[PDB]
Symmetry: C2
Subunit: 80 residues, 2 copies
C-alpha cells in the first residue's frame, strides 16, 4: 500500500508544468499519484469541489489539496 | 541526480502543511530539499526574487519555482 495523492487539473499549461515536474518527481512507492483531468469530464467537477480542489492544478494529499502554481480556479471552469 | 529543491517559507501555518506532505513526498534520495526560512534571513528576499520565488510556501526544483497552494506573497513581507 501507499499514500494517496490525487492530482486534479484541466490540462492547462501551468498544470502541465506541475504535472511534468512535481507529479513526476513524486514516487508511486510512497504516494499513489492519481491524476484526474478536468478538461473534458464536467461531471468530475462536482467531485473536485468536495475533494478540496478550488483551483488547478491541485495535489490532494490526505485530503489536503495543494494548489501548485495558480493557473486557473474551479470558478474558471464553472461557467453556468 | 541529486539536485536540491529549494523550499522558501515564512513560518506561516501553510509552511508546515507543505513541509509535512510535499517535502516528504519529494524525499532527499531524489531531490535534496533545502528549507529556507525568510523569517530568519530577511536579506534573502533578493535571492528569492532571482530564484523565481514570488511567494513563500513554494519550492524551486532544478530552477523551476513551484508555489505550493500560494503561501504568502513575497511583496507582503516587503515594503518599497
Amino acid at each position: 500500500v501507499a499514500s494517496k495523492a490525487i492530482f486534479y487539473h484541466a490540462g492547462c499549461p501551468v498544470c502541465v508544468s506541475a504535472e511534468q515536474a512535481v507529479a513526476n518527481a513524486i514516487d508511486p512507492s510512497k504516494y499513489t499519484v492519481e491524476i484526474v483531468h478536468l478538461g473534458t469530464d464536467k461531471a468530475r467537477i462536482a467531485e473536485a469541489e468536495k475533494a478540496g480542489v478550488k483551483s488547478v492544478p491541485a495535489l490532494v494529499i490526505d485530503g489536503a489539496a495543494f494548489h501548485i502554481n495558480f493557473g486557473a480556479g474551479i470558478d474558471d471552469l464553472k461557467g453556468s
